[PDB]
Symmetry: D3
Subunit: 177 residues, 6 copies
């Protein structure tokens, strides 16, 4: 059974309103050692948002702006990239790499469950013991079509036929390992 | 509030990640589709997407052979997905912020459609109903600003603050 | 056909322009009317560059922030000068230009003359890359080898690699 | 002079090409010899695009990884097709093209004819932007206002904003 | 006295060799809850390097590579951006924003002192209480030249002269606040 | 090993962040400099840099007035600095990784010069001495690989591993 986002997420998740001051966000973040706060939907159809340590440092501290007057809505990401609780941990890694984020709320429908970060992955994913070759089932399926085509064209007992099924075999050994 | 589902393209073609890029292009030519949704292999598997830009930039721009390359080599999986109920203004903004042009519209595990920058341009109400993003947050923050002025100055001056509020609420309406 | 397919053979041939001074609203109006995802911005005079405004400019810079299209002008979101395409540019090179400049569409300009607009959509729907794939710079790979093959059959005898220039040639 | 300074007036006029099939080593050799930071890659024929290889291509893709320039070919690190510059393009528009495409140099091409190479260095050392600054798209700002000024003196009487089209004009 | 990088850095800094496996790096990182490891110079002239949580998640986990065979040198940044111990915390924020990193060794000459991150800034910088308007001394100096030029051109008792010194005054009030 | 200081441009002009962009351009024209170093205002203040690309992209490309814009508005401060002793191969690599083209060469608090991609192209020994980056790490990792093979297989087979090592050391030499 593939390890899931919900299994490694930080379960204690804290929200803040978009209208709050960056100072409020900072105080909350220091008090609980949080590197991301989820921004509270204002109603059922309103997306989730997120404000991160990197937003705060890059957009506020780096320009010497005053966090006591700046608001969260001015720095947050809303809507933000979200993670399904069932999403396998190799996919959460890939999402984060592709969208260039380090952190996302874990959301089931409209319901906030947690927050998942690069740190959650580093510290709690099974990627060292169980590295999952991405899309390996698509590779197997493609390689089986190649083998069938080659075998039907060149003969079911030809060396190229055998070599093409050996590509399938190797990919299949890896997946069930 | 205009929703993603009210402007999405409803007819949505799926393809497997194992299919050749040539198979993708053939289906896209046939129906004039600029994205195909990649279908989950099982219940925990995310949605994926393969677009015209993926094909042009990753295949055609190197002169690779589409008959031998596969969809899984150029798709985005997991992809950014859109909730059917998300305001179109927020769709525009998600797309800007993640630098994508199109996404499947998903409810639970179910594909409902695909939505693009083209759908927003052609069908959104952004010209006649410009939506100031986060204007409701500005309104709560101006209220909080007023209460700090009334407890510090006193219950008139405090009145100067409370007007700012009305000018924003007027603008929301 | 056996010749390299050119940009002018797959471009969208219909091209209305708009002025840089027009409102974004006018641009959207025109785009909706004729189903356009890019509009070419008209040079003010013979020496003024071509420009372009796209669906992405409008959606990312206007809609995404809630700006009023009726007050914004095209000049505020357009790209001018824009990347242009020569009519005779091989469709594979258009693909490559687009990936390296991170654009999706451009006008096809012949000297000072606007001829059409070519997009990633044109390439996807009308390119021959599926039946005639051809690795970019294969011709240069050859030149380089047919020259290494000069120096290898110069030093290590004319009797002993050359089929590389032969195989690459059929490809 | 009072006219907009053109790219051809500040370009570096001397232009040696190199073939895409040449080794990186040959390219560096030529670049060192004549103090060049960009080399134009020669079209293989009338329909083949211009290309360019730069000091940054060489330093980032070759030196930074320790690759052997004597074995790598220009085609492996060049940009082809490259962004090109029309000889008559206003020097401010060249600046802008460069920022929007994130390049620092390009060939100046007249039709199919190579005329020179223009760089951020040419702009910095030879542009008139210090004595003659001119906000990009000011001319469009005017057009837009001289038209708002039509509709404001159409609705709210010809007796009552227009000096905007006047002040902007001297600027 | 301006708060410095060395005052807010994580002092306990851990190094690893470039030749170590990504698995070794991961184990070290989990054991001490580290989000960056500094890569050990091989000799006195050899630059420092860094490998981060984000390198590991983006380059290893996201592609299902095997950390037990991959080496740190394949994913690290070497040389890396480094932070002088005396660098004011508003500048460390700005460096990180401009180079798009979240984490850097603190280095004095060739000597490693610590590691400083976006989290160190969020949790321990004085940016909420003392926001520092970047380059405010350059603005003051520029505004004083403007005032002098204007006053000499238009008269030392003209309204535009007074308005230009008022720009200086406002900037000066802020800096000593 | 060729060092940054052996290929840097030695003559280095500084400018204050308060200077106009026009003042920057005038000095750059006069000496043909594609960067100026911005000098620390005091002992804890970092080095900064302003380059030809900053000027062209941030000033000329908008048609802003260089006589009114100031250096502080377009400079990089703090900037990426280079140690005089850093191998040129590593300079190339720092520049690739941070996407810069030039940097001051600093020792302690002292400006020694400026080094660019041009200095590397013109004066580096990268053609005749290509430097495989991290080859010394590859060598330690292949040694560690050998010892794991000798304790698991036994002291010959283990011999297959130890050759890989020599082929890399040969290549370092
Ligand atoms: Cl973050
Ligand atoms: Cl975290
Ligand atoms: Cl797309
Ligand atoms: Cl577009
Ligand atoms: Cl360059
Ligand atoms: Cl990181
Ligand atoms: Cl940290
Ligand atoms: Cl530069």
């Amino acid at each position: 059974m593939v390890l899931q986002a919900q299994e490694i997420m930080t379960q204690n998740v804290v929200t803040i309103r978009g209208s709050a001051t960056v100072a409020d966000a900072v105080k909350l973040m220091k008090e609980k050692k949080l590197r991301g706060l989820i921004v509270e939907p204002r109603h059922e159809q309103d997306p989730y948002g997120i404000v991160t340590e990197t937003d705060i440092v890059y957009k506020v501290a780096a320009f010497g702006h005053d966090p006591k007057t700046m608001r969260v809505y001015e720095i947050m990401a809303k809507p933000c990239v979200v993670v399904n609780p069932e999403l396998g941990v190799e996919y959460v890694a890939r999402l984060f790499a592709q969208t260039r984020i380090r952190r996302a709320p874990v959301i089931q429908g409209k319901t906030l469950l947690g927050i998942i970060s690069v740190s959650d992955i580093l510290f709690k994913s099974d990627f060292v013991e169980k590295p999952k070759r991405l899309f390996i089932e698509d590779e197997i399926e493609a390689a089986r079509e190649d083998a069938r085509a080659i075998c039907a064209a060149k003969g079911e007992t030809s060396p190229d036929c055998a070599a093409a099924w050996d590509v399938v075999e190797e990919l299949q050994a890896e997946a069930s390992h």
